Design a protein around this ligand. Structure first.
Ligand SMILES: O=C(O)Cc1c[nH]c2ccc(Br)cc12
Length: 167
């Protein structure tokens, strides 16, 4: 048993809810929250900007030190950093950004990072301002992630569309 509430069950291991991932993280304090990161860990907008704002910018301070030491992530890659006040850990995962012209085929590689963690709270990778089709992102998630993933979908109309189209 775990502390996630009100999720619709999609598969053996994938669950979904219409929720603000910031508010969900604050309530659950999961072991792992996933950030929809970029390779520079520049958290100004979207989930990255919302998560970072909820940490009072401590996520961005930590991330700038990580980049100064290690250099940028790869598209499809990830790193584990602090979860600050939201979670034990934050898994920063870089899905391809279609609006920057990155290869959508890297989405599967991005989701494979989730398999290193038994349970995660996560957004859909490469959807929203990332420019990929969220229906596609959900299909890649279910076909790639084998660990238990709790997906938070911010947009109510998109949540309803994802559930009603899910195969
Ligand atoms: O949860 C959503 O509504 C869509 C979504 C999934 N991933 C996202 C990343 C950024 C932004 Br902005 C939105 C998204």
């Amino acid at each position: 048993v775990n502390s996630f509430s009100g999720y619709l069950k999609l598969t053996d291991n994938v669950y979904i809810k219409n929720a603000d991932i910031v508010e969900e993280a604050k309530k659950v304090k999961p072991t792992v929250v996933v950030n929809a990161a970029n390779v520079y860990l520049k958290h100004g907008g979207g989930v990255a900007g919302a998560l970072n704002k909820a940490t009072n910018n401590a996520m961005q301070v930590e991330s700038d030190d990580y980049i100064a030491t290690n250099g940028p992530l790869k598209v499809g890659g990830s790193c584990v950093l602090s979860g600050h006040n939201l979670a034990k850990h934050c898994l920063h995962v870089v899905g391809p950004n279609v609006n920057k012209g990155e290869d959508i085929q890297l989405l599967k590689s991005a989701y494979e990072n989730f398999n290193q963690h038994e349970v995660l709270l996560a957004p859909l990778l490469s959807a929203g301002i990332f420019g990929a089709d969220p229906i596609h992102s959900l299909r890649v998630c279910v076909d790639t992630v084998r660990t238990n993933v709790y997906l938070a979908v911010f947009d109510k109309n998109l949540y309803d569309k994802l559930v009603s189209s899910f195969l």
